[PDB]
């Protein structure tokens, strides 16, 4: 009559409250993130909020380069975010050593999702309060987005969004794909795809952006990289001339 | 440092095992899935419940191949099912194929899956699995079979059954329509009719996952050369193959 | 029913780990300490409450060295800080053994990051009762870091924690604004002394002892060294001249 | 593994788990033992909640540890098997290294030690068993009777009982058994054993089993009729008076 | 730590009973009924399935009667999963005995082993007991036909006729009324059906809800035979006694 | 209040306190009084010993660690044994492996790190004893105060135990007088005995009751008992 | 293959008198045909009025003397500064040596 | 529940204090030291007249020069005695001499703290403290005849005289008055009997009371039932006078 | 090696074992009983490596005596032999295998038949009419091949052993100091004390 909400055991209704409260934890950083697929690229966008003037902005980041090919964005407290990062980086390197090819995006998602399921079932391990969005241009499946949560769930996406205002981004993105009647962003260069992601982010949040408010990672053939404040600024000048 | 070496599932004064009861409640909320056994095959089906319009439900397999002749589907907690599919596939090799040089018969693999679910019912520091499984298979000396596996680790053989959200109404629909002389093509027809009652939303090849355990597929083997290798009895129907059958419904 | 604050690795309904927040309370309860990043290094400073005339001066050293190039200072439960530096030293030695190079600062930060974070994952351990300020010089510039009991850390232009964190953070912010190009190591030593003296207003009931250490590429060759003698006295003199 | 301290002290200096173990001994069927001049007699009661059993295959309440020492118990039957097995092994181990069978004192001291161990080890509850251990030391013609309890304490008795209504039968033995002169005959020693049981047992055709151990590994279990003869005679002793 | 969530499965009530054992027995009293009856020339095992559907398969199913050996079989009342774990260790123990001594395991030895494993979960480990009761039917050249029972408390006893599971009180009265020592196996089969028929929680007693097993000595072979009754064989043995 | 939070060591209070550590500190406060002090040439330990009866022994509070080092206890005697015996091993390791007398400051750091571990892990309790360590190494005379929380502090003089506030007040006043007792053992012991009387309050200190330890420049760590302390009364 | 032993030469000699006892030893230390040291002390004061020498392989000899000195130290700690009687030392050294029965100290030792 | 080795707000170990209450429920034990030898005495306390009183062994030998008396949960003392005996013989094997009465005790007390439920430091596996106190009495060359009291806490006090168990505070009040530095061994013999007679529930005799001593010359010896009865007879006649 | 012989007749098993124990150039004992009683109706004789010989025998003795008490029953010779074999067959691939050869001589009270088992140090068990271990067999096997009949009385069996012992005393280099002879029948085990100068 009390302790079924403290550890990961079933409640009379068939629920795991520790897992539910872990979802709540993912919204603690108050940051929204989204991901979109281009013709041959994949873009992650995340908000960057630096409340302190004493912080070094270049270290405040929730995007991680897991391998040469895989990139990951995280919603949730940073200690948990970096816990998941290091594990994923280790898991990717180990995969390469044992199997002789680079770990595909969707497999690393599965492996991380499986690891979460464990903290869901074992009592001494608490779930991590994070949602992990893996992106790459996989050599078999093309541009790819895969996302895992504290429940141990994971699935692929045409596009995705995560954060406090997640629902507004999602229905905005759906409405674009109904009109376009296809599941990707029809553009050759990744530059315009990044431009699309920001444009459709502002539109759904109703807040303008400067170079220090955002954070952009891009995945291409044989490379994943994160943009500098200056590359974002260049990209912001392009969208301003559009309207 | 895990100090949880005691059971989390124990007996209450009434004799109930609380955690197993609660695991069954979780399965009850889960999406409806079913199984039907024909004279010349078995069919297992479920609904691909979309978590978002943006998600790609093709990447989410609710149906899984265990051995080339054995398949599985579920109701309840997806995560739990996924890791169970992984363990079951491995145990089929380590406890059977690596010893006897052939794939385990349906009853024994089921027995081994059940065994894994039992341990979570008793081992220190764990909760039961929040899934019920439906396993359809074929082995030379038993023919076609279908079993249900529960969170407690119990398994029963079924001629036809359904689990989850709308099991009660589905079981009643199956009793009316099942006979011991059903062909496979008929068993698929019934499966689609039963599932149409559970789905409120879109009912098509994209929102329904459906697999069979039937005849040997030589074109799906991948190689020719061994006469005593004729290929998998498990086949997942494509989005296109389901829609063809829905047009004559 | 509640009770989500009785065990370490437990989430409360609002997504928080209450035991970690309680650890912070022990940190806020502690002696104030700071860090300034300059154009070629880092400076560290700490308050030392003189409870009795029987405390031997210059002896109860709170600032610790990791390897030869990293300095660490912390607020809160002192023994927890030491344990964390002991781990740091092992972690650094492990790095400078597999790889020949002495451990990079971002690298070292994460090593402490993951260790502290590990103490928020299980109910059989307690979180750390310290916020830690550490940094030094490596292959590409100087770095300053601050690490919370949650395992959270960021890079800093200036950092502060403890009883007088308010006063300090305000003082540092004026330095960031007024000196955009950068402060020099020599100046940052003098300046740190003022920040500790001004942050003492909160704890001003008992007298204190100033302790400064620094790591500068052109002033200490990139090696962490303490400030003693002439430069230590000059810094106190500068702080005393701007406290009047 | 699991090492939770289950046997712990309470505010007034009691180990409640050891205390509750005795409550299981009180629940268990009655057991008695009286020592004559040249023999020890052990007596036990059989329950009759259900009577459709097979007595041949169901374990009789008096166990043999070695060919010269026996053990009877009151309490949880499943626990007692674990104690019996361990004592049987130690019995063999002693013959192996000392080249002589165990004394009754020693074999009791071992059992008592096992029980005591289970009262200050983590992850275990104490045994819900008290034992009566009886026999003769090798080359010795002097009778031995010992009692152990869940706390691990042991002592030797002229006469003793354990289990349900042992209070009432100990009462009987305290006024009847003479220290000046024990029962001189093997026959009259069994008489005192059945008499003391008939207080608690009810008129029992079964319900009472007797085992008689003499020196030099001479142990024998009495039949229904042999016991019945004592039952037929004892109840005719009262009617004359 | 974990102290807070520990059920403490293996401790005594102030009364002297074992909580978990008692509650596991309460669990079993709700399971399907099983019956064992010993005749002079063999043994009979019979079990009631409990709740079943029309669509349930009975061909492949043998969920309550399990073969341990060429000469020993069991009736299960309780959790099937829990039971299979115990059946499997007992199947192994029998083979170990045969490997070691080149002789088939005597029935009580196998029974004692299983009862000791059950007793284990009663004194140490911190794990819940097995929610299972067994009826053992077997033959050896020492005692001939033996019938044993074992429960979660690790306790075993020998029986001429016995029941486990649901309505044992009612079933025990009806057997104790009609059992006699000079019974023949075919009379014992009849008794077994007659008992179950009056203590069923169902409308009528049908073949598909029943499982039957006999352990005879071949009335021509001169050696011990086991028989698990096939669906049709129960259907036939049900018409003979006039239940249809 | 604490109820629910005094649980066990691995629990923080809402205010940020560790009650198990605090309750350990309380066991010291009810232990018998002991005083420490030093100049530059010598370091002095003075402990008042507590009996259980007039028929009992005055249980020893001073333990030798190495030829140059040792300590006094207040609180749980078993725990002082565990800690001193750990310090003996660390002193010995430094002698054997390095041929180096272990520095007094480094000895404090090891006890700190040992105590800290008992305050962060489930199952373990904090040590229930406070320690005064005197030593003479390569940097002159030293006196350290140990707290079960892990807190170590070097001091000119100090006191712990029952009524220790009188001795600590007196020592704080006497600072400039004792620190300059260089090259005279007796006159540092004399200052120690006058410090311990400020915490007496109840009884007169006697010949089989006082404990004295000294170490310094030309003096190895040695403990005086019985008729050997008669002069300082 | 690596050989863990060597011979460092030297000779020791002990004689007891009525109220005294002497323990002597040459100060020379050698390897094969080379002199390592003309003055390398081999007989040590171990405290408690005991003198000891371990002649043979000096590395095993120094380990043993170091281990006995340390044994004396702990005998004082564990037994309230009691003196180690020479008969007790002998027995203690027996145990020190026999501990390495299957990989021995190559010393002939006198106290 | 709440941890085993835990501190009360008063700064004491729960389990240890509760264990001290269990010793108070034990049978009385009384030691006295002289310059002719230490003397031990215990109350048998047979719970039933059928109990063969001489099987109550509450006095044990550790070595020819070290004896031991118990009080409380006596079953616990079996391993304590085992470790006392072993240590005494091991010391002899290692040093060709007798273990110091002092060093012998210290070793027993090292066991006393060896309880817990977790790992930090050196590993000790025991679930609860011992529920028994010990009196340890003997002689060595260094410090003569000695009497120690060893509590489950881990501490040991040397005593000129000590009582433990049920009527210990009453006995300790009497021992305070009756002890002096120049008692003869026989005067300490009668004393144990007098103080036992007083605090026992039963009328003291040769069956419910046992005597033991230790001299340098004859070692440790348990008094036989015929010898004890003579001293009780001697005591009764000396009480008759004044 | 020492002499370990065994012969099964109509209603009994007879075991004959050398009395000598020799180490180096000295005969240390001439009255050594090289046998153990495993149960009332089962006997085992043993020869081989110095220490291993008795240690194994007593380890087996204890194990069968433990079984006897546990089950209040005596195991058949077949059962006992199968136990001994398994024990040896285990040790044969261990760090230091037992080096003991044994003969098991029992009387199956259930079958009313004598049984003789020969098992060597490797765990090679075989049932035989007559058996021998070591160099003894090189003389006795062919002698018994000739003089053995399966229906002989116990008295005739002792005559047949005497013919082996005389042969071995004539043609073998070792003085094995005679034999101790034991009978295993329906009435258990007994020793033929007057075999020396019969």
Walk me through the structure:
The PDB classes it as hydrolase/hydrolase inhibitor. The entry lists the keywords proteasome, inhibitor, carmaphycin, epoxyketone, vinylketone, HYDROLASE-HYDROLASE INHIBITOR complex. The structure is cut from a larger assembly and holds nine protein chains of nine kinds. Chain A has helices at residues 17-25, 78-99, 105-121, 166-180, 190-205, 229-242, and strands spanning 33-37, 42-47, 63-65, 71-75, 131-138, 142-148, 154-157, 159-162, 214-220, 223-226. With 243 residues, chain A is an alpha+beta fold. Chain A has a five-stranded antiparallel β-sheet. A five-stranded antiparallel β-sheet of chain A has the order 3-4-5-6-7, with helices on one face. In chain A, strand 9 and strand 10 (223-226) form a beta hairpin. Chain E has a five-stranded antiparallel β-sheet with strand order 8-1-2-9-10. Chain E has a five-stranded antiparallel β-sheet with strand order 3-4-5-6-7. Chain E has a single domain (1-244), classed as Glutamine Phosphoribosylpyrophosphate, subunit 1, domain 1. In chain E, helix 4 runs antiparallel to helix 5. With 244 residues, chain E is of the alpha+beta class. Chain F has a single domain (1-233), classed as 4-Layer Sandwich (Glutamine Phosphoribosylpyrophosphate, subunit 1, domain 1), CATH 3.60.20.10. In chain F, the strands form two sheets. Chain F has a five-stranded antiparallel β-sheet with strand order 8-1-2-9-10, covered by helices on one side. In chain F, strands 3-4-5-6-7 form a five-stranded antiparallel β-sheet.
CATH topology name of chain A: Glutamine Phosphoribosylpyrophosphate, subunit 1, domain 1
Range of helix content of chain I = 25-40%
Q: Structural class of chain I, please?
A: alpha+beta
**What distance lies between the first and last C-alpha atoms of chain A, to the nearest angstrom?**
59 Å
Largest sheet of chain A, in brief, is: 5 strands, antiparallel
User: In CATH, what is the homologous superfamily of chain A?
Assistant: Aminohydrolase, N-terminal nucleophile (Ntn) domain
Number of domains of chain A: 1
Assembly of the depicted chains: part of a larger assembly
Q: How would you sum up the major sheet of chain I?
A: 5 strands, antiparallel
The share of residues in helices of chain A is: 25-40%
CATH homologous superfamily classification of chain I: Aminohydrolase, N-terminal nucleophile (Ntn) domain
The rough form of chain A would be described as globular
Helical segment count of chain A = 6
Number of strands of chain I: 12
What is the annotated CATH architecture of chain I?
A: 4-Layer Sandwich
For the largest interface in this structure, which chains are involved and how many residues does each contribute?
B-E, 44 and 36 residues
Class of secondary structure makeup of chain A: alpha+beta
How are the strands of the biggest sheet of chain I laid out side by side? 10-1-2-11-12
CATH architecture of chain A: 4-Layer Sandwich
Query: How many distinct beta strands of chain A?
Result: 10
